[PDB]
Amino acid sequence: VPMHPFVKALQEHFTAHQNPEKAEPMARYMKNHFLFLGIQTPERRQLLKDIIQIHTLPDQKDFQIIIRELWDLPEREFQAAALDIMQKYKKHINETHIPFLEELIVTKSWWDSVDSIVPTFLGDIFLKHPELISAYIPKWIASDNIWLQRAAILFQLKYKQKMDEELLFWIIGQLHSSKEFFIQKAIGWVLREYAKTNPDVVWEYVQNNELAPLSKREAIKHIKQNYGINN
């Protein structure tokens, strides 16, 4: 069975505009976990738009197929384009897609893909269906996979006043002893972000609960101005 023609067309068009000179630093930035074609986001977006204009966006019946086929291509720009394409099918994504999104998180995993899946696609799903959080979050925290652990921390990133504080702090408590940078930093990020909504609660939490030094420092990067730094 041949590659979906939309994916084949995207692959041809991206490859025709590859930049090996830019690809080397782009790959280094991701610690050489991936090959790159060397195409940065503004051009990558336009090349995708070109193919949509010529071929049209595929029927929704092929949405998951398109994403998987792009996920399986070696160069990282194809996963970035896959995420761009998933946004175009946003109105068709629902709670039944959580396992599909899980599988994207744990394949070709790095912060650039995971941080574009979790606070947006998964965040929106669990905002609408909070009763499903406990069907996934405990497993993610218990898993050996640091990207599922990061997903548990960051899916509420953008919730603002809809933040479940008890849940957030319970999740952070479960993961606060992790020595993994991407967990310590995720804890720092979600606390820093939620502090924009409720600084008093974040300040009290970080002053009175154990956190990795990196997590605490990132959490209070801004709000330490509001409370001061005691001698």
Partner DNA sequence: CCCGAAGTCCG
Partner DNA sequence: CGGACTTTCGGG
Interacting residues toward DNA by CB under 7 A = 28-29, 31, 40-42, 111, 181-182, 185-186, 189, 192-193, 213-214, 216-217, 221-222
Q: State the minimum distance, in angstroms, from the CB of residue 213 to DNA.
A: 4
Which is nearer to DNA, 167 or 214 (by Cβ)? 214
Which is nearer to DNA, 20 or 42 (by Cβ)? 42
Which is nearer to DNA, 3 or 223 (by Cβ)? 223
Which is nearer to DNA, 26 or 66 (by Cβ)? 26
CA distances from 93 to 66, 135, 152, 206 (A): 14, 18, 19, 36
Q: State the minimum distance, in angstroms, from the CB of residue 211 to DNA.
A: 10
Q: State the minimum distance, in angstroms, from the CB of residue 136 to DNA.
A: 21
Rounded distance, CA 8 to CA 192, Å? 42
Which is nearer to DNA, 65 or 222 (by Cβ)? 222
Q: State the minimum distance, in angstroms, from the CB of residue 179 to DNA.
A: 11
Q: State the minimum distance, in angstroms, from the CB of residue 225 to DNA.
A: 11
